[PDB]
Structures are given as structure tokens and as C-alpha cells.
Amino acid sequence: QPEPDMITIFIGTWNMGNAPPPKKITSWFLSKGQGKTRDDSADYIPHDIYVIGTQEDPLSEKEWLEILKHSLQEITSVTFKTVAIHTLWNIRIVVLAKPEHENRISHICTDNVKTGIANTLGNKGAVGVSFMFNGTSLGFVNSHLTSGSEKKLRRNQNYMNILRFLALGDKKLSPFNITHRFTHLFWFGDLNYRVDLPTWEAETIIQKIKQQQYADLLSHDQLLTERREQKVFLHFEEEEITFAPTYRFERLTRDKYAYTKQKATGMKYNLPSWCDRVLWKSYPLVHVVCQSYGSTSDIMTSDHSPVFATFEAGVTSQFVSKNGPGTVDSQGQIEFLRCYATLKTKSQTKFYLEFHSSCLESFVKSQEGENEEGSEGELVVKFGETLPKLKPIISDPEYLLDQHILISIKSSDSDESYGEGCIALRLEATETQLPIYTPLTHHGELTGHFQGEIKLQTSQ
């Protein structure tokens, strides 16, 4: 039975509003309702992996697992296996997988981050899960960020805290945060960004939603505008939104947006907003295609509607040769030519590189680079032809061209990373000098760039 080279992944996010769900929630897992929805001809076809993020979840783990498994079994006639479940307060992540994948899944990690301080610590934060699926690392983050239309900068800070402190994936990747540890990272939740229009415009916004005219609302969505200004979610993707705002509804209908200030809201307005979102970030040149992104219309126990997203995602096999794993394959090599980093830092330490990849037996430290001053006031760190030749464990091009090299540039004085990025080995040619590039980030913010050439030798 052959190993897959693609799987489909369901992502759900639902802020349940502290209320039990209704008896039927199958529309959620079928990607049925508003937006980019799934074709009826696929309804009986199970996804490989289901990842369910809830916020304001009132159920026990057992209660919610029973509902989720019985829902999937009704849709698909498959009894899904529980990969992981993790809860922080009322923020929960469940990962379920088809039973045939049980032996393909390993290295399961869970963690949470509590955001805020004193007043603002005790209900917001994130949960996450990571695992290996054959040769492919997968990470999943469900975050409930700070609420309130005038707290976008707090949400941005919450995002930075979560990606700094959430401890998932391979701990040996010590310079790298979760935005670089996975082949595919999915980040979803009640992110709580609002449509930034005046309170006086509430009824105008409602009119627009009834006309399915979202363009002048999306142009004021704080998550889209903060992402365009590189304030948050740098280098993540999101599918185009084609569904109505998912918050704030009167319960037990979807006919009314409950936006007016009330004692129960702290006398805050809740203008219709796309609070509930799914974003992703995959390594360069890995297949990932969003096949649905929408909200359900029939599930009305909460003041939010559930959101679904589905994805095709490229996966690779657990490769064995006569040589690697457990030795190098001297028919393989990775050479970096004429490489330089450009850094936004004022520091004048010397810098060295670390190269990390599961195609190497262990990470590789470079020599220090040569600092020069860039014309427009920046640091240029030149490596020339000094970089160590990397010796992959396997030389077969079917394996090596699917791999990635993570790069950290570190201070010789502190050994702290000033920037992290990723280079694909999915080259146009082998035995050929070819341009490479990655932006460099630290704590998820842009700190510079790495560019040069690569020359890859495979067994072919």
C-alpha cells in the first residue's frame, strides 16, 4: 500500500460562546454554508487529518471528543483516531486522523501560551499541536487573542508572544520559532480583529452584509490592514474571504447582528467583524492549496459562526537508502557560493551562520563573515566562498530536491540569532550555480535578508 504524496487537512475554528453545541454540526466538517464551500460530490470522502480549534468551549475534553468522533463517523463511516487534545482554560485544540495514518504519525507535541500580565492574564492565549506525518512536519496553533475594536496593537503583541513562546516541533531547532519549524504551519482561532469603521455606520454595515457586498468592509478589516503594513502574521497566507462576518450574532438565529453596547459587553460596540480566521505558512515550493474557506449558516448556539478551511498539502515519505540514515551519502553535497546577509541591526559584533535540516546528521556552524557598511546605512555580512560544504544523509534527488535548509545568523558575542530563514532545495537544475534568497526574521519580525547562490549535487 503506497505512501501518500498529498493529504487533505480540515481546519475548524469556533468560538462557542460558553454554550453547548446543537445536536448536528456536520455542516462544519463538510465545509457547507457561505464562502468557498466544498462540492457535494466530496461529502463522503474523509479528510486525512481534522484539526478543531475552539474558544469559550464549555465542554469537557471527553464530551467534545464524543461529539466530534460521532459527527465524523456519521459523515464518513470512519472511526477517527485521536492524535492529540490540549486545553488552556476554555481554548482547545483536537487533532483527529484516519486510522490508516496511526503508524505514519509520530513526535506528537502539545503546548500552550498564556498572554497578558495581571489584569490581562487568565483567559486569552493559544494552544498548539505538532507532529511528523512520514517525512513532513505539521504544526497547528489555535489562538484566542485580545478582544475589542481599539486593541489591535494588543492582538499584535499577543501574536508575537505566542510565536516566541509556544514550544512545538523539534527542540534541536533552537534558533527557530514555530514560524520556521514546520513544513506546513496552520494558525487559526478567534483572532478578534475587527472591521474598523465608525460606530454610527453599524446599520450601513449590516445593509452591505445583506447585499453580500463585502469589499468596503474587508478594506477596513484590521487583520488584512495590519498584515499589509507588516505588523503581524508576516509571511503567512490567507484565502480570500467571501463569507459574511462571523461575529457578533444574536443566538439561535443568523438573521441579526447584535452590535450595540450592553452591560454584558462592558459597554463596548461589537460591529460585525471577521474575528474567526485560518492562516498558514508552508516552506518555499511545497504544495499547499486551500480548497475551502467559509462559515456555517445552521449552527446558531454561539454569537460566532464556525469557520472551516481545507487544504491539499504535499507530504514526503520516510526515506531509507543503503547509506543514510545513520551515515552521509558522499554522492550528495550542498555548496553556498557568494552569500551575504543584509541586517537591519546597529550591532557591530561578528556573525556566523547555522544551517539546520533533517537532511543533515546535525546542524553546521560556519566561520564568521566579513562585515561591510551598506550604502543606505545597513550591515552587509559577506561569507564569500568560505561556507562549509553540507553533506546530506541521502543523495537520491527524489529525496534531496524535496528538502529545505533553515538558516540562522548569530552574533559571535552573544550566540543569539539576529535572523532566521529557509531555502528550498527544489532547484531548476543540479550541478549548476543558482540564485537563492530568503527574508530573515527574528521574533517573527523582519530583520534582514540572505541571498547568494547554491550548487546542489545529487546521485543523478
Ligand X SMILES: Cc1occc1C(=O)Nc1ccncc1
Closest to ligand X by CB, 386 vs 451, is 451
Number of residues engaging ligand X in binding (CB under 6 A):
4
* Of positions 123, 297, 451, 459, contacts ligand X by CB under 6 A: 451
Structural Rg of the chain based on CA atoms? 23
* Angle in degrees, CA 380, 454, 376, rounded to 5: 20
Closest to ligand X by CB, 120 vs 451, is 451
Closest to ligand X by CB, 157 vs 451, is 451
CB of 284 to ligand X, least distance (A): 10
Closest to ligand X by CB, 241 vs 406, is 406
CB of 175 to ligand X, least distance (A): 21
Closest to ligand X by CB, 34 vs 451, is 451
CB of 434 to ligand X, least distance (A): 9
CB of 393 to ligand X, least distance (A): 27
What is the footprint of ligand X within residues 74-133 (CB under 6 A)?
none
CB of 412 to ligand X, least distance (A): 25
CB of 102 to ligand X, least distance (A): 40
Does position 435 bind ligand X by CB under 6 A? yes
Closest to ligand X by CB, 154 vs 442, is 442
* Of positions 60, 437, 443, 445, contacts ligand X by CB under 6 A: 437
Residue nearest to ligand X (CB): 437
Does position 374 bind ligand X by CB under 6 A? no
CB of 179 to ligand X, least distance (A): 18
Length of the chain: 460
CB of 86 to ligand X, least distance (A): 37
Does position 44 bind ligand X by CB under 6 A? no
Closest to ligand X by CB, 104 vs 442, is 442
Closest to ligand X by CB, 166 vs 381, is 381
Closest to ligand X by CB, 197 vs 436, is 436
Q: Please give the Cα distance from 238 to 280 (Å, whole number).
A: 7
Q: What binding mask, one character per residue, do residues 390-429 give for ligand X by CB under 6 A, x or -?
A: ----------------------------------------
CB of 377 to ligand X, least distance (A): 16
* Of positions 350, 382, 449, 455, contacts ligand X by CB under 6 A: 449
| Residue numbers at the binding site for ligand X (CB under 6 A) | 435, 437, 449, 451
